[PDB]
Design a protein around this ligand. Structure first.
Ligand SMILES: O=C(O)[C@H]1O[C@@H](O[C@H]2[C@H](O)[C@H](O)[C@@H](O)O[C@@H]2C(=O)O)[C@@H](O)[C@@H](O)[C@@H]1O
Ligand SMILES: O=C(O)[C@H]1O[C@@H](O[C@H]2[C@H](O)[C@H](O)[C@H](O)O[C@@H]2C(=O)O)[C@@H](O)[C@@H](O)[C@@H]1O
Length: 229
């Protein structure tokens, strides 16, 4: 078998507060299964050090979903509880194979919608400007489909090396730091005031591929979800 992610210490804290969804939103592995050696080509320890996710197919995923720690059920939190909810990662986004067009690698999501997606995207125009092979944030400020429901930002061009991300939510404000630099500084999340079902996700969620067989692949050198109070 492939080497399991849980065979080293690095990812145990997040696996202790996650379930894996693969190849859809259906459950693939409970937290205890993840901590106890769950493995496959979709989710394995790569190069002795990366938690790697792989998935093909439109809207398919191999994704961790935040759970109450220590064998608890699904978590839900609010954007304005006075604490800071923080997700910190170090991600190697390799060159994506032909047919893969957008891969969501971290989220804040609730019962209804994604508050935030951080995604790799092959090419896109944002605010009249073309970008290629880059990392984007998409924040929902509404539940509709017109462009005014979203705030989209160029976070960074994709690098060969690991790229760090920190997502901080405090007092209905979102901050995204990339390689130690604040990129998104206090984006308003007030539309979500009253929602108590938010949670973090991370992995690979394949969006709008041009081929159903093309496999998205994303490597995490680090991932942690914490609440600072
Ligand atoms: O046409 C789009 O690509 C549309 O998608 C929106 O993101 C959605 C994702 O693609 C996934 O379907 C899932 O995560 O739901 C997302 C959503 O409904 O917010 C946005 O990227 C939007 O800007 C875009 O028009
Ligand atoms: O598939 C979706 O549209 C969303 O489902 C969410 O996962 C749910 C889902 O109901 C599962 O069947 C399971 O029973 O509970 C999941 C949960 O963790 O809340 C999310 O995967 C979400 O990202 C999807 O957009």
């Amino acid at each position: 078998f492939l080497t399991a992610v849980s065979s080293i210490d690095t990812f145990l804290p997040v696996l202790n507060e996650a379930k894996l969804q693969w190849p859809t939103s259906a459950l693939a592995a409970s937290s205890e299964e993840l901590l106890g050696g769950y493995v496959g080509s979709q989710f394995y320890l790569q190069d002795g050090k990366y938690m790697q996710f792989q998935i093909a197919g439109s809207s398919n995923r191999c994704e961790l979903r935040q759970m109450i720690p220590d064998g608890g059920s699904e978590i839900g939190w609010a954007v304005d509880d006075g604490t800071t909810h923080t997700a910190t990662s170090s991600i190697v986004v390799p060159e994506q194979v032909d047919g893969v067009e957008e891969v969501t690698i971290m989220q804040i999501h609730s019962g209804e919608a994604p508050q935030l997606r951080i995604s790799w995207i092959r090419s896109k125009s944002l605010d009249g400007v073309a970008y290629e092979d880059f990392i984007m944030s998409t924040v929902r400020i509404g539940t509709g489909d017109s462009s005014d429901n979203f705030v989209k930002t160029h976070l960074a061009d994709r690098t060969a090396g690991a790229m760090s991300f920190q997502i901080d939510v405090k007092d209905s404000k979102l901050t995204i730091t990339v390689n130690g630099n604040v990129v998104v500084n206090g984006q308003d999340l007030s539309f979500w005031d009253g929602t108590d079902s938010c949670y973090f996700k991370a992995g690979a969620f394949n969006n709008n591929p041009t081929s159903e067989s093309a496999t998205a692949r994303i490597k995490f050198a680090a991932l942690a979800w914490v609440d600072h109070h």
